[PDB]
């Protein structure tokens, strides 16, 4: 129930929610691999975060690039315990977020499978970020959700699919109110840590 010692791969880690999650986790004793595009500024950020953080240049929509990134993570920290998908947050449906997430989940599951189970039998934790569907003034049922639905709808199924390997799968979705109060990373990061530390949360979607 502690992130200390865990190795986390964070897509879109050079900035935004990804960077905020990395800073939080590293500050809590974990190791982080910032997986992001070359020239994204991930190299500088990984450097600033200390020797418990490395930069893995890669495009999340590329299976081969993600394999190289996971190999780097294993080469530098020994293994992969957690994957946090924060990248990208054709065009609207199969966007970078959905494609990168599915690509990461399919590849990291095999890696996490090699890990030895813990007390509760968990080998890994995967945390996804739902894609936001901008409010367009719709009325009725559609108004009750702020996410596209692709990643959210796949959460329970994927959690059930990886249960035998002891891999928990959770998704963080947006709330209905932008909470912009004008025109929060910390909150998102704290939720990531909380999900990682509670072995009882699995196959669920939590709105921030």
- Determine if residue 17 is labeled as part of a ligand binding site: yes
Name the catalytic one among 91, 144, 181, 200.
144
Specify whether 144 is catalytic.
Answer: yes
Nearer of residues 132 and 163 to Na ion, judged by Cβ: 132
Q: Which residues bind a second copy (CB under 8 A)?
A: 5, 7, 27, 31, 47-51, 53, 74, 76-79, 114-117, 120-122, 135, 137-140, 143-144, 153-154, 156-157, 159-161, 163-166, 176-183, 202-203
Nearer of residues 65 and 111 to a second copy, judged by Cβ: 111
Selected binder of Na ion within 16, 113, 185, 203 (CB under 5 A): 16
| Contacting range for Na ion; rule: CB under 5 A; set: 8-16, 108-116, 118-126, 195-203 | 8-16
Q: Which residues bind Cl ion (CB under 5 A)?
A: 130-131, 147-148, 150-152
Quote the least distance from Cβ 152 to Cl ion, whole Å.
Answer: 4
- One-character DSSP codes across the chain: ---TT-EEEEETTTSHHHHHHHHHHHHTT-EEEEEE-TTSSHHHHHHHT-TTEEEEE--TT-HHHHHHHHHHHHHHHS---EEE--TT---SSS-HHHHHHHHHHHHHHHHHHTSPP-TT---EEEEEEPPB-------SGGGG--B-SHHHHHHHHHHHHHGGGTEEEEEEE--SS-------HHHHHHHHHHHHH-TT--S-EEE-
Looking at residues 52 to 71 of the shown chain, list those that interact with Na ion (rule: CB under 5 A). Answer: 62-64
Give the whole-angstrom CA distance, residue 128 versus residue 48: 25
Q: Which residues are annotated as a binding site for substrate?
A: 131
Q: By CB under 5 A, name the binding residues for Na ion.
A: 12, 15-16, 18, 62-64
């Amino acid at each position: 129930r502690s992130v200390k010692g865990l190795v986390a791969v964070i897509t879109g880690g050079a900035s935004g929610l990804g960077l905020a999650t990395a800073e939080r986790l590293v500050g809590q004793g974990a190791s982080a691999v910032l997986l992001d595009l070359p020239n994204s500024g991930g190299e500088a950020q990984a450097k600033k975060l200390g020797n418990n953080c490395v930069f893995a240049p890669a495009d999340v929509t590329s299976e081969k690039d993600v394999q190289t990134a996971l190999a780097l993570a294993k080469g530098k920290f020994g293994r992969v315990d957690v994957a946090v998908n924060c990248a990208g947050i054709f065009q609207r449906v199969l966007d970078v977020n959905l494609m990168g997430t599915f690509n990461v989940i399919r590849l990291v599951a095999g890696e996490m499978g090699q890990n030895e189970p813990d007390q509760g039998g968990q080998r890994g934790v995967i945390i996804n970020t739902a894609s936001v569907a901008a409010f367009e003034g719709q009325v009725g049922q559609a108004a009750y959700s702020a996410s596209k639905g692709g990643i959210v709808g796949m959460t329970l199924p994927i959690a059930r699919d990886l249960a035998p390997i002891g891999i928990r799968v959770m998704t963080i979705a947006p709330g209905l109110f932008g909470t912009p109060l004008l025109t929060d990373p910390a909150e998102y990061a704290h939720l990531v840590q909380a999900i990682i530390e509670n072995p009882f949360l699995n196959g669920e979607v939590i709105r921030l």
